[PDB]
Amino acid sequence: DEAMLYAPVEWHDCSEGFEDIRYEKSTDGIAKITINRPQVRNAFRPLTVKEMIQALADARYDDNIGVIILTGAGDKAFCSGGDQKVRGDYGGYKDDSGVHHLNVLDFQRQIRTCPKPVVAMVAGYSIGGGHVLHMMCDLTIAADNAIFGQTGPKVGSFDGGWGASYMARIVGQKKAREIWFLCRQYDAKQALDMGLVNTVVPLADLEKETVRWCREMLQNSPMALRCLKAALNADCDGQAGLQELAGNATMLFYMTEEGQEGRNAFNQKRQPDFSKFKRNP
Amino acid sequence: DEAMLYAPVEWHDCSEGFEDIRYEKSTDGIAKITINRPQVRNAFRPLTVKEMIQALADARYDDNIGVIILTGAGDKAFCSGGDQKVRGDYGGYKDDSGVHHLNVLDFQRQIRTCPKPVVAMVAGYSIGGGHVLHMMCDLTIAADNAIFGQTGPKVGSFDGGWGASYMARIVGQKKAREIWFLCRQYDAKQALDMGLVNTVVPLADLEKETVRWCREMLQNSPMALRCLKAALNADCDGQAGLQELAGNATMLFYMTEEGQEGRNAFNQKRQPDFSKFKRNP
Amino acid sequence: DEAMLYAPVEWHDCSEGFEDIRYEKSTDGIAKITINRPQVRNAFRPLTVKEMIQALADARYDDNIGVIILTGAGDKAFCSGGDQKVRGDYGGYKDDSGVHHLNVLDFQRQIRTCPKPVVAMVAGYSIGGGHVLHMMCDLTIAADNAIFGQTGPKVGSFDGGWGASYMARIVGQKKAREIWFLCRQYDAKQALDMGLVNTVVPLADLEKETVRWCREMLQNSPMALRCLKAALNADCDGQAGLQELAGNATMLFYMTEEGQEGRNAFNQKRQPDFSKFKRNP
Amino acid sequence: DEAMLYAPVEWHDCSEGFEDIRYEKSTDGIAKITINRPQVRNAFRPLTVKEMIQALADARYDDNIGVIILTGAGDKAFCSGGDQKVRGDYGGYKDDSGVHHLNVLDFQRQIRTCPKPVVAMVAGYSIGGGHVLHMMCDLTIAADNAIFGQTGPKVGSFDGGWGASYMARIVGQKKAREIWFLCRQYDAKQALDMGLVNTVVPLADLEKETVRWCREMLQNSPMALRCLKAALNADCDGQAGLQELAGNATMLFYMTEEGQEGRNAFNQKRQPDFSKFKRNP
Amino acid sequence: DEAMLYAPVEWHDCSEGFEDIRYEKSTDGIAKITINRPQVRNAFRPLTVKEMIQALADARYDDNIGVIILTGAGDKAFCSGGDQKVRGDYGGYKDDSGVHHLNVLDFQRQIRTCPKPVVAMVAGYSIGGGHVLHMMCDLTIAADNAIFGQTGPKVGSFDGGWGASYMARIVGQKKAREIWFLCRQYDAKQALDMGLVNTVVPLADLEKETVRWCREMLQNSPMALRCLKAALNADCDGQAGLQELAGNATMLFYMTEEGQEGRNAFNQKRQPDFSKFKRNP
Amino acid sequence: DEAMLYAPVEWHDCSEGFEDIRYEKSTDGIAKITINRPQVRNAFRPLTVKEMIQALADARYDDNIGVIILTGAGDKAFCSGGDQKVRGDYGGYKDDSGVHHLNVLDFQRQIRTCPKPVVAMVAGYSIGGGHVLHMMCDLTIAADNAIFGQTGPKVGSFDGGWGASYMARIVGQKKAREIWFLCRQYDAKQALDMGLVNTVVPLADLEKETVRWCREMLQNSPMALRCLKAALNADCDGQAGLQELAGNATMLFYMTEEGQEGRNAFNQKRQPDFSKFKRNP
Numbered sequence A, B, C, D, E, F: 001d002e003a004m005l006y007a008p009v010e011w012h013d014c015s016e017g018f019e020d021i022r023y024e025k026s027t028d029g030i031a032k033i034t035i036n037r038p039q040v041r042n043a044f045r046p047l048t049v050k051e052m053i054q055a056l057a058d059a060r061y062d063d064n065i066g067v068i069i070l071t072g073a074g075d076k077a078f079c080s081g082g083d084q085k086v087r088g089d090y091g092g093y094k095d096d097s098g099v100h101h102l103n104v105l106d107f108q109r110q111i112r113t114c115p116k117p118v119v120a121m122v123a124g125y126s127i128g129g130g131h132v133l134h135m136m137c138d139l140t141i142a143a144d145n146a147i148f149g150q151t152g153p154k155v156g157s158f159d160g161g162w163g164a165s166y167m168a169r170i171v172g173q174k175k176a177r178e179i180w181f182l183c184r185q186y187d188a189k190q191a192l193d194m195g196l197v198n199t200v201v202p203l204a205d206l207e208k209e210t211v212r213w214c215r216e217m218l219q220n221s222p223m224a225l226r227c228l229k230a231a232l233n234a235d236c237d238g239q240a241g242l243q244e245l246a247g248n249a250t251m252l253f254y255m256t257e258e259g260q261e262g263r264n265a266f267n268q269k270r271q272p273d274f275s276k277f278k279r280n281p
Ligand SMILES: CC(C)(COP(=O)(O)OP(=O)(O)OC[C@H]1O[C@@H](n2cnc3c(N)ncnc32)[C@H](O)[C@@H]1OP(=O)(O)O)[C@@H](O)C(=O)NCCC(=O)NCCNC(=O)CCC(=O)c1ccccc1C(=O)O
Pocket: B039, B040, B041, B043, B080, B081, B082, B083, B084, B085, B102, B104, B105, B125, B127, B128, B129, B130, B151, B152, B155, B157, B158, B159, B160, C246, C247, C250, C266
């Protein structure tokens, strides 16, 4: 239904109180987080990350939202990683109160455990920490002007966490070592060819196509989506992944009569009677 | 309730067709598989394993059975492992047709994936392949005359699968290397002290205590039990463990109105409407 | 040797007793399992699965068979997954007796642990559970009319087991999330491009090329093939994978003089003497 | 130095705005989170968990805190798990707004990823979700009146995430399956013997001994502790564990001259000169 | 800077004492190990491996070297694997003294744990054990005449270690099973298409391009490069990977004032004072 | 026979060329490496480690040696870890040439990958890096005066590799966190009780009992021993563990006629004929 998928999107502004990002919601259930620091190619300082964390937490708890888009303001950059202008000498990035942070690690975890799909909408540069962020998103929609790469070994940094291992799970070990060791830039076609992004579209149609992809997911079962996301994380995240996968199993079990009987019996101060529930093979 | 836990048990014989084992079921939902080759300390030959497999399959599919006991005939042996008298040169144990088998590997997987708890009831020797068998069982109830250990490096064999890795998940890596490398025998107290068995009871009380443990589990949620068994396997078995765990999540999802709407929609040749189901955080 | 590789194939029917599938063997060592429910696009019901499990067990134990082909009858579908017409409310698919099954999980594990290569021969739709089946097969040969995808989030289901994790080990995490979250369909070239199938051939050439691939494997060491298949599973299946791989090492050890000395000594009531066997570095 | 270790402790309150918990800080760097619903054996409702999350976030960000204690009010209970009185049918526990939560999962991950040691101080009952909470804590100090166990299969629930797998990494797979399948209660001595808690002390000495253990850690390198905690999580949590461990490596790298040259060169818009930094073997 | 990247390279010979290989170093920090047995398509015998290990150890310990190239003499072969003419019956390859070796396993490990990037420069055949060798190298630069493949199942062998699992992490599980099961040969384009090599260049420009890639890495942080290599290994090598990654964290910690205070306090026979180092969030 | 087990041991000196260690061999197949720096409680400097690696390589290749003992000179210390007197600021311990090493990491991997059992014979202190060394050994025989612990967080170091993860696989996650975070010392009984060492014997009986354990293993299959050691590593070491396990499978395959046919056919320039080797199930 292209008429539905390509219908106009009406964004409602929810940016009140944010300084470094914009946060918007569509009537049909898309939340969009936009890094708004185009002057530094949308690099994040600790405040930026803090605000993205708050926005993503809101999206998670808004039961009208089914999908999140992460993007950068303007056409030149999605995100250029940590703001090197505030990178201190004592183990992180300094906020205005002098505290050193590495809070993008919290945001990565939050994207990972979000039960709703998160989509990176990438125009122009997705570089360094900004590159890890697009990789963390479940899907990436790239404009034909998109440019991807890491710079760690050039700028005195590295992401040896999901920035390395998870990258290898997307593009394979040979490509991952190349990306990290040489710190070249890759155009959208190169990214597409290596399986790094899901599709490449003309810059002009970036939001149009991204919104179609979100709407396709919004037609589907939110329960199935969250279970599948956990299951896919589970191939990577050991017990942390089991926590997500089993957690959803618990939720489901709480919705059954057998599970509910355990609760009722406790509340009614009696023994449970699980005999009425047939054992499946 | 001790009166209920220690009530007499009435075994019904279901051994029709078996030559190397006995197979029985209680009215209150316990299936018991007994290796019946005491003349060889209950060593298994390929036929024996084939029968244990058939029995355990029957127990899986009988919706009145909730727990399975595995044990050996007599008081002298649980199982002394592969019957070395029929072990061929061509990579396995010879059946009367001359085919070389290692079908205990199938029995290990079957116990592993059985959605009902399997309890090893050990009197006397649990040795070699027979020792791996008790380990594979979810729980082990040991008589005070029980003796445990491996013999592989002494008799020209080894179990480098669950017989090694899973043993280490039970007794730790130092004890596991000790048990394998030296091939000593360990008595019941030594076994309990290392976490190898769940409890040790006087030989005369062996079945009485095992049935008590079985009955305590039979009071509990069968769904919960199978989910937890899968979850505990999943700490060991990677994607195979995910298959089990996720498979249970799939079963539970099928029992929800959200999952059912998806089926209904397809059968009625219409679009699913999941909008009616609230998204949890 | 194209003459040999493209020689005519001579199928012998072994379907007697099967209601939902065909089962055939070639003189040169190929067993072929064909889902035969074209009226439902080769959707499996619980009987279908039980028969496929019986057929694959037969092929495993037939020492003349070296390779298995799995395919769908006709040219419109390989398999469309679980039969939604018989999917019950109580956690699975109803058989004629009203028992609720998810027995395709058994069949997945059987393909996985089969020591002989299994080849999916896909014409037309490989969808849902039927898509996971082709993925489980070691290799996939696709016709130019082949169509691939999942539908779980559309039809209220999910495979978060090998259907998710193992999919990711084939096409990468970005593609896996796309496939599962959007539930689009993908044509043969799309599947080839993402590494989902091994090759794409004109529909007319489907069996001809599949049989060629089978015959190439049939020239190779059956022992090496099974060790390698276990080794590749072991990158995914944790301790379950070690069981497979170590289990083959045991088989091999049994074929050595050192291994046999262990057995010989036990049978001959003497202490083993391993001094004759040089310690390799 | 026992005089230092057993010095009186001086708690200052930081509970402003909390209804379900108390939150306090000692003058020497210990924070203490106390579940304060002793009338229901310190069962948590969604609000309770939310408050615990806020308190733990505070402790994490307070650089004068080096260690956190988790405990329950009164002598009778540490925590009895999820509050069954507010457990709803729709897959979680209802807050006053009707939303269904499983937010203890967030708290579990927050304890896990906390860079500071978290110590469970257990008096009386640690049961169900309350038992998983003490397990998640790095260390457990138990009073002689402490009682441990799970109840899931009895009350229609299960924790198949860290509550299962991680439990196995503490007590081993045999005890873990016993604990979950039978849902017995275990006294302090039983807990100590299976390795489930670190020490058992007289109830009268619980706080004094817990504070001693805390002070011992407070004498040590905070950086070394966080790295080790991450490293120990990493044996369980796959790529999520790598995120923590590598994250600490990044922090350290940012404190070296080599890392800083990378940053300086970027800010100064010149090529970095890494050649002046000797390559270690 | 292409002028710099494509500048002449000045090799100096360091082959003194080697019989099967050449070993050279450039003034700008590239070490090159060349298998020199072109008469047997650069197959390795145990001495060849021994020599390669010695050269790679020398490269690791030379603080002037930052990158290693592995290659074969001539342009017909990179390496055709183990030398079958000296392959013994007793489980390995015979040296002149009749000891049977599989020492390529040590060389694989040594490439894996080398803190400096290792680059396969492939002209002609990279086959069998020789194909596993290029896979182990972090990157592969292939000439347009390069040919890739395994032969194990044809020549009575298999690499079920990194040869299998790590191959799957490169090309995906479907392509890995194809490569191993059929033992076909793949041209440079096929290899590139499946992600098996990083780039393909004209044969006459093989070294020129390889040296360029090396110089690009040689501009980057050696510390970042070794941490990332370890992090990428860590997604595959479980605890051995943790050893590498954490071992780099230890190295970095030693370079900090906090870590040094621990050493200073010990050497000065006083108690450490870690209180001066602020805790980061 | 106890007469055999407790027979006198004749040590022959092989220490020529060593400065920091002694190296001796028994006539019945035991190699003993003794750290010889009692004046610093047998702390290792880079030369010490280099010597131990040389000694262990020699033991690996001496086909008369079946088991290695690692120990410390005198009765006061096994090993107190890294020599803090030569620990430099630049990420390692300085040799006489000023190079900074962490070469114990090499020795750890060498113990891990040694195909012969390695036994720690511990009298007195096993502390720090010295404690990790005893853990790495397959088994530990402790004297009643033995003391165990880590000191990292006190002395500005950590071993977050095998020092952490592998310790947890020995003593469990709760104890492992205790040991690392508090840096207490533990007597021999405490070590035994937590599963940290295999046995405790009177100091005067240390070598006598250690040699008995050694001789017990020396009676068993060297091949079974090495396969089992690999299999147990494989529960921990991911693909590095697969390499060892599969590597052993390859060695065994080379000893079979099916394997050898592949080699013979290649050497005789003819097609292999594997049809003579029946396919096991
Ligand atoms: C069990 C022992 C210690 C009991 O000793 P006891 O003194 O009480 O009895 P015996 O004096 O030995 O007399 C008992 C009779 O039973 C025979 N017998 C005992 N065990 C076996 C056996 N396993 N196979 C064949 N016969 C057995 C004795 O010979 C005697 O009969 P008679 O000759 O007088 O008529 C003592 O019996 C003992 O040690 N038995 C051997 C224990 C053993 O070594 N088992 C084999 C170890 N290996 C395996 O189990 C294979 C498992 C494996 O590693 C594997 C891994 C992967 C895939 C497949 C496998 C597999 O092989 O299955």
